[PDB]
Amino acid sequence: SFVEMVDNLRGKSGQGYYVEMTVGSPPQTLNILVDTGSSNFAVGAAPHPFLHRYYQRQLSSTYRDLRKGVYVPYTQGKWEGELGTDLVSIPHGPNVTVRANIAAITESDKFFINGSNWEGILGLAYAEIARPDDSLEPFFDSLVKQTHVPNLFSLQLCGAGFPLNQSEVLASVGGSMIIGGIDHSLYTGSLWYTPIRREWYYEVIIVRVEINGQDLKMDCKEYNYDKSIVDSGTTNLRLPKKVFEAAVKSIKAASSTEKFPDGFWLGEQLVCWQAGTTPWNIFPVISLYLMGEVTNQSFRITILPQQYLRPVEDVATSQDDCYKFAISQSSTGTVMGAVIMEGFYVVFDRARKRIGFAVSACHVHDEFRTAAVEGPFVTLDMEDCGYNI
Amino acid sequence: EIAX
Structure with missing residues (x-):
């Protein structure tokens, strides 16, 4: 089955x-x-x-x-x-x-x-x-x-994280797409659903963003200008230009001790650390709140840096570990890409005009932190967060 | 890296 x-x-x-x-x-x-x-x-x-x-x-x-x-x-x-x-x-x-x-x-x-x-x-x-x-x-x-x-499908995507080679992309197991249902063995905790605002892209509405527990305090529209979508075919998390600068500041600051090429934050250049040295703890978590299914109700998914620092292979082809910054700038709305999906089991419940998130069985864990899907939260005037013309 |  x-x-x-x-x-x-x-x-x-x-x-x-x-x-x-x-x-x-x-x-x-x-x-x-x-x-x-x-x-x-x-x-x-x-x-x-x-x-x-x-x-x-x-x-x-x-x-x-x-x-x-x-x-x-x-x-x-x-x-x-x-x-x-x-x-x-x-x-x-x-x-x-x-x-x-x-x-x-x-x-x-x-x-x-x-x-x-x-x-x-x-x-x-x-x-x-x-x-x-x-x-x-x-x-x-x-x-x-x-x-x-049945009219729904699920996507459990996994990122192996020791840079994958072409003889490893055949060998690796990247994930699962359950057609016509939900497989309960592939996630833990419970599913949280956000409505699909409109049926073109799978377009959702983000109602709050926090970085290491701090609200960016922006007007929500800014998070969904001119839309937010869930896109398995886009690698990075792409934020609209304001949100992107705000998040980059917060992340630079949080990782101040260390130094990175200016083109690192544009996701052009790599950074590398001695194998298993990478200082993950100095990179913050990012929490996205999504509109829920009930009046004045929200929920949130928490992204670890393991996800937004994507791994790739060295400029010296040496052992010590390298990454690209998988957060990038968008002039066409927020895109929750594959890096964001990787942590989670995502249900595309087309039939009930919703999309659900739960922590994936797959998701890799850093020592002291864990990716999560948590609610319920209360959030007022959530409809105001949707961008209109 | 891929990008709709």
Whole structure:
């Protein structure tokens, strides 16, 4: 049942978590990135240096065609291709097969990643943000319409933290995507849900931020200007320009004893410490409060620095441990990326227009602190925190 | 690193 979907994702925050799927009759196996930050199902359909395989449209008995092109632009990366449909399957997912819209990517810039080990992308967000337009039923919509698979999914993403190599991205277990349900063995404590403000991105509303127990005291709108989303396909936690400066100040200050290249805080440069020397305790926790399910009720998730200091391999290719700053600046709203998701079991309860958080079974723990999901809290005028035009 |  759901056991068979446990551990069905591979990858890392920096390059994406992917799932295995087949497409076409006869079936063609492909690794697909799992993206809650977009709407389109797309796959390589023509050679590319970073692609170890691709979708041959002309070998599927079942490939239909729409003779309609598509362009999809992301914050970074973009692709162009031809629209058709085909039968699709998830070996380590539910036992069903659906005919779903599929973009065959013909041309692309900055979208496929060197030795990422995926060749496609699965946009799980809602039709409203699908290209060329909504009419284009995203995959999950198809799956729910054509089958008895319930309308929700869960994502438990894990980051292993000794920089992962390409022979380790195959070997590592990055996580689990439970289709059509919640697997209770994969989290502890209880689930806290925040409503999905609107069904396009999975867009939530942040009502308070604290760093090591201190409120930034900003007007909430600032936290959700012009939106906050949950995006498995974005690596970093991306804050809007004011919130970002505020958080960086607080974090610099808290970590004053030590010195970092000015490009460190822009997430351009690494920092390294003697292996197992890194002074985690001088980096603060960050608590995000989310709108709850009941009037004047909030809850919070606490992010450890282990998450916002992402690991990567040395400039000398030496043992001592290195990291990139996984908090970055946004001109297009708050994005709770994979680093933020890594700690948690996240339920995308599309059916009840909500998203739940609980501490993940996976989450790595620093000695004296622990990631948490706690409530209830009281918070007034939460609707005022949503940004409108 | 990846970025919608």
